[PDB]
Amino acid sequence: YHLVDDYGRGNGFFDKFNFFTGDDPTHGYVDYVSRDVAAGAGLIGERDGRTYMGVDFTNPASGRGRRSVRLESKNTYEHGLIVIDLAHMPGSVCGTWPAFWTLGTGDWPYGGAIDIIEGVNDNTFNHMVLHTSDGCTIDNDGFTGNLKTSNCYVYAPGQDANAGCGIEATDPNSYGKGFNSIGGGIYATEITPNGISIWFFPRGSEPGDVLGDNPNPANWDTPAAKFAGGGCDWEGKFNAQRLIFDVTFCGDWAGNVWGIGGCASRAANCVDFVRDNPSAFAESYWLVNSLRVYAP
Numbered sequence: 001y002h003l004v005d006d007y008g009r010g011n012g013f014f015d016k017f018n019f020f021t022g023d024d025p026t027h028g029y030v031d032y033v034s035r036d037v038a039a040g041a042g043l044i045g046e047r048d049g050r051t052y053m054g055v056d057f058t059n060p061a062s063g064r065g066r067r068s069v070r071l072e073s074k075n076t077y078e079h080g081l082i083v084i085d086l087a088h089m090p091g092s093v094c095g096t097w098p099a100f101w102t103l104g105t106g107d108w109p110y111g112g113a114i115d116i117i118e119g120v121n122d123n124t125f126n127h128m129v130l131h132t133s134d135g136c137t138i139d140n141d142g143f144t145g146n147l148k149t150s151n152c153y154v155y156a157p158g159q160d161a162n163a164g165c166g167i168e169a170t171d172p173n174s175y176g177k178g179f180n181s182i183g184g185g186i187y188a189t190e191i192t193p194n195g196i197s198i199w200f201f202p203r204g205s206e207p208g209d210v211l212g213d214n215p216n217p218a219n220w221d222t223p224a225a226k227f228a229g230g231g232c233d234w235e236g237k238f239n240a241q242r243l244i245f246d247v248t249f250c251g252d253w254a255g256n257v258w259g260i261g262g263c264a265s266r267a268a269n270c271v272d273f274v275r276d277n278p279s280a281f282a283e284s285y286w287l288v289n290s291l292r293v294y295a296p
């Protein structure tokens with residue numbers, strides 16, 4: 001592997017993304033704002049050399065929903081290794097649905113999609129998921145996490161629509177609250193014609209070459225998640241991926257599971273909570289040490 005893109009920081013980092021401002025594809029109670037409005041609302045910036053991307057935790061929400069940003073990289077990658085070092089990620093906040101992921105080019109779901117860091121509400125464990133067209137299932141080995149769903153197809157029979165094929169990390173510090181309390185860590189994601197692997201290195205435990213000029217995944221510990229096997233054409237189900245950061249609220253996932261988990265008591269429904277409790281979302285932010293993409 002060799003470096004192909006060091007995303008830098010602050011404005012140089014933001015220049016590498018298009019800010020999505022359309023209504024949320026996942027129907028959340030979110031108001032994705034432009035870069036200028038986000039900077040004016042303090043949702044994006046630089047914090048001591050780190051890149052910050054958060055949500056409005058000040059104002060009662062109105063309009064489409066609570067203000068946030070969704071950045072989609074201008075560049076795409078066919079195959080490669082995406083390494084992100086985060087000092088902080090959106091917390092395990094009720095009503096939230098943060099995600100750092102990649103989305104293939106072309107019509108959904110034919111380009112495939114990879115959820116590297118994702119969860120909802122008060123989740124504890126990171127949930128790594130793939131989303132593809134039909135004809136793509138994964139094996140049970142080569143990873144430390146626990147497989148929850150094996151079919152990556154958006155309409156896998158018996159699975160909720162777009163639940164995808166997901167593996168749940170075993171470390172309670174792999175997401176939200178726990179992750180932030182340890183000062184974050186590093187998530188490395190490798191995309192090859194034979195599958196996808198995602199490693200989670202909690203702060204301090206990362207390999208010595210993960211942030212360097214030639215990271216070599218082959219020598220790293222077992223990944224937290226691995227998507228591979230003959231039940232999928234890894235090369236054909238995934239085309240060029242673009243990197244995406246977002247934090248939405250309620251919507252298709254978080255809003256539909258709100259009333260069953262531990263957040264149900266905070267409010268009648270997800271929307272009312274997100275609308276009337278701005279201060280709840282102070283922890284819903286990404287704080288990037290670095291984002292580097294490599295190619296074979």
Ligand SMILES: OC[C@H]1O[C@@H](O[C@H]2[C@H](O)[C@@H](O)[C@H](O)O[C@@H]2CO)[C@H](O)[C@@H](O)[C@@H]1O
Binds near residue numbers: 257
């Ligand atoms: O987990 C069950 C839940 O899945 C929801 O789909 C999510 C999917 O899990 C997530 O990885 C993707 O990023 O967003 C979709 C939103 O549709 C599904 O919508 C729920 O009905 C279902 O209970």
